[PDB]
Each structure stands twice: as structure tokens, then as C-alpha cells.
Amino acid sequence: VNSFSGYLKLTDNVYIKNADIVEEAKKVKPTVVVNAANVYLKHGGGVAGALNKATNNAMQVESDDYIATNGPLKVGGSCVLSGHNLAKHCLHVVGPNVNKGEDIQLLKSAYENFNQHEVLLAPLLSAGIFGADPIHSLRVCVDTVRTNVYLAVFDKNLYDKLVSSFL
Ligand SMILES: OC[C@@H]1C=CCCN1c1ncnc2[nH]ccc12
Ligand SMILES: [Cl-]
């Protein structure tokens, strides 16, 4: 039993809700919140910009030190950093950005990072400003993640389409 509330159950381990991931994380304080990161951990917009703003830019400060030490992430890769005031940890995961021409096949590799954590609050990877089809992103999530994932979908219209079209 966990403290996530109001989710629809898609499979044994995947749940979905219309919610603002920032507001969700502040309420639940999950062990892990997933960020829709880029390889440079430059949290300018989309989910990443919103999560970083909610940390008063502390996420960006920590991320800049991470990059200065380790260099960029790989597309499909991840790193674990602090969750600041939002969660214990933030799993920064880089899905392919279709608007940069990155290979959508890497979306499965991106979701595989979730399997290293027993429970996560997450967005759909490569959705929104990353330019992938969110219906596809949900399909890959369900077919790749085996741990317990609570998916927050900000847009109410998109959420209804995701549910009504889910196979
Ligand atoms: O697929 C990512 C998704 C789709 C469109 C825009 C960003 N996205 C978000 N998903 C969940 N919570 C969010 N809070 C702020 C943004 C946000
Ligand atoms: Cl985004």
C-alpha cells in the first residue's frame, strides 16, 4: 500500500492520472520522481522546467555540478540526483527528442531505467515538447516497465484520449 490517490489502473503495475506532476510530487513526496531530462540536464521548459522552478532552481544548481564532473548523459540514459523539496530522489531520464531527430527506438531504453526503482512517480517519456506520440509512449511504458509506475498526465484532454484508446 502506498499514498498515491485517484489513479486509474491500466495493468498490474502501471497507473495513470490527470495531474500536474509538480503538485503530485509535493503532495505525495514519493521516493522517486522522474524528470523528463535532456543530456545536459538543462531544465528549461516542459516537465523539467516546471520541476526545477518548484525547487527554486536548486535542481539546476545540482545538475550543473553533476555535468561539470561527469559530462552529458546518453540519450536513453539516466542519473539519480536529489529530489529536493519534491521527493527523496529525482531520476533524470533522457528520452529521445523527436524535434532533435533522435531515434524513437531509444524510448524503450529510457523506460528501462525505471526498473531500477520499486515505485516511481513519472511523466510519459518523450511526450510534450519532446515531440513523440504519447499513445506510443504509454505503450512502451506498459511493455517495458515492470516496477510500479504512477503516470501523471498534465493535459486533461490528452489523459482521456490515453485511457479511451488504451489496449
Ligand atoms: O509528456 C510530458 C507532459 C506533456 C506535455 C507537457 C509536459 N508534460 C507534463 N506532464 C506532467 N506533468 C507536467 N507538469 C508540467 C509539465 C508536465
Ligand atoms: Cl516535457
Swiss-Prot record:
How does the entry describe its membrane topology? Multi-pass membrane protein
Give every Macro domain span: 1-167
* Highest taxon listed in the record's lineage: Viruses
| Activation and inhibition | Inhibited in vitro by GRL-0617.
Which reaction is recorded as catalysed by this protein? Thiol-dependent hydrolysis of ester, thioester, amide, peptide and isopeptide bonds formed by the C-terminal Gly of ubiquitin (a 76-residue protein attached to proteins as an intracellular targeting signal)
Subcellular location(s) of the protein: Host endoplasmic reticulum membrane
Its assembly, as annotated, is: May form homohexamers. Interacts with N protein.
Protein function = Responsible for the cleavages located at the N-terminus of the replicase polyprotein. Participates together with nsp4 in the assembly of virally-induced cytoplasmic double-membrane vesicles necessary for viral replication. Antagonizes innate immune induction of type I interferon by blocking the phosphorylation, dimerization and subsequent nuclear translocation of host IRF3. Also prevents host NF-kappa-B signaling. In addition, PL-PRO possesses a deubiquitinating/deISGylating activity and processes both 'Lys-48'- and 'Lys-63'-linked polyubiquitin chains from cellular substrates.
The protein in question is named Papain-like protease nsp3
Q: Which organism is it from?
A: Severe acute respiratory syndrome coronavirus 2 (2019-nCoV)
Q: What gene name is given for the protein in this entry?
A: rep
